[PDB]
Amino acid sequence: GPSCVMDDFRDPQRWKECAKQGKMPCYFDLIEENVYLTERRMQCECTPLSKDERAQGEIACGEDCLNRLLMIECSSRCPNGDYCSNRRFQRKQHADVEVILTEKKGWGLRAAKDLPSNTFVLEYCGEVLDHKEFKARVKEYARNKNIHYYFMALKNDEIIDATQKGNCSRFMNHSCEPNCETQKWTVNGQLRVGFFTTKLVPSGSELTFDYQFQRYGKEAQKCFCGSANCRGYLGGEN
Ligand SMILES: CC(=O)N1CCN([C@@H]2CCC[C@@H](NC(=O)c3cc4c(F)ccc(C)c4[nH]3)C2)CC1
Ligand SMILES: C[S@@+](CC[C@H](N)C(=O)[O-])C[C@H]1O[C@@H](n2cnc3c(N)ncnc32)[C@H](O)[C@@H]1O
Ligand SMILES: [Zn+2]
Numbered sequence: 001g002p003s004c005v006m007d008d009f010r011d012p013q014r015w016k017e018c019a020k021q022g023k024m025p026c027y028f029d030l031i032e033e034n035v036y037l038t039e040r041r042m043q044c045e046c047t048p049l050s051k052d053e054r055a056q057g058e059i060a061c062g063e064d065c066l067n068r069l070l071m072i073e074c075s076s077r078c079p080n081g082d083y084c085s086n087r088r089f090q091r092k093q094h095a096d097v098e099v100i101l102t103e104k105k106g107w108g109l110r111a112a113k114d115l116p117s118n119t120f121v122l123e124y125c126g127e128v129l130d131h132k133e134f135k136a137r138v139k140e141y142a143r144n145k146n147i148h149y150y151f152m153a154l155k156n157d158e159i160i161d162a163t164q165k166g167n168c169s170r171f172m173n174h175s176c177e178p179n180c181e182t183q184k185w186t187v188n189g190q191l192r193v194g195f196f197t198t199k200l201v202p203s204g205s206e207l208t209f210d211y212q213f214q215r216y217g218k219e220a221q222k223c224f225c226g227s228a229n230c231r232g233y234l235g236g237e238n
């Protein structure tokens with residue numbers, strides 16, 4: 001299969017014509033941050049790491065950071081300042097991942113390196129919709145006869161749509177037996193969704209998560225994850 005690194009998405013011209021030669025997926029607007037179609041705090045208690053503790057390689061805002069435990073990211077005002085390891089989303093500290101053609105699912109994501117268990121992969125970025133905007137879009141995509149859908153539930157009246165605008169996170173595929181999960185994190189009072197490994201993911205391996213978004217309409221998409229325990233279709237029951 002053809003592959004490409006995440007830096008290949010930064011050059012729209014070379015991208016567009018790579019796409020014409022089918023060596024890259026179709027063009028979409030690349031964004032670093034969620035874009036609201038309609039516009040709508042305090043620090044952790046981690047004891048600053050001494051320069052020596054930092055040298056030894058001790059982790060700043062690690063497993064015991066009060067902010068991390070609550071899936072809240074520290075700000076510029078964290079007592080560990082620049083050394084805070086709990087600003088992954090804001091600092092784009094994404095895993096090393098490539099975009100690959102799969103036999104039947106379209107494009108996908110794979111580890112370029114071994115990925116430890118419980119590792120941040122990518123934020124799922126896109127246009128944030130309310131229910132009304134969501135229902136407009138479902139109808140628009142249905143009428144265009146789109147195959148690939150990019151909806152991700154954020155919360156009540158907030159659905160992320162990475163159809164037109166998003167990042168490489170939009171290439172991660174469903175599996176019934178996944179190696180990743182979603183986590184909803186608080187970043188500057190705003191909620192965001194990121195992919196995280198659930199196990200050690202060998203280099204070259206396809207990255208996958210259990211997509212549980214509630215099915216609408218009559219005909220559901222067939223699942224080609226190939227797990228022995230495949231549910232056979234994409235989306236949650238209803
Ligand atoms: C053709 C047609 O009209 N259909 C009716 C609508 N259904 C689904 C229902 C559930 C919402 C929507 N799926 C996604 O947005 C979606 C899938 C998916 C995935 F499999 C992996 C990862 C991500 C981020 C994913 N998002 C449309 C598809 C069939
Ligand atoms: C968010 S997109 C994932 C990226 C997509 N493969 C692409 O090339 O743009 C989700 C879509 O990918 C396909 N897909 C994802 N997981 C799949 C699976 N397990 N089996 C079959 N198709 C899958 C479906 O068309 C689905 O609507
Ligand atoms: Zn902390």
Ligand SMILES: [Zn+2]
Nearest residue numbers: 061074078084
């Ligand atoms: Zn911190």
Ligand SMILES: [Zn+2]
Nearest residue numbers: 176223225230
């Ligand atoms: Zn499956």
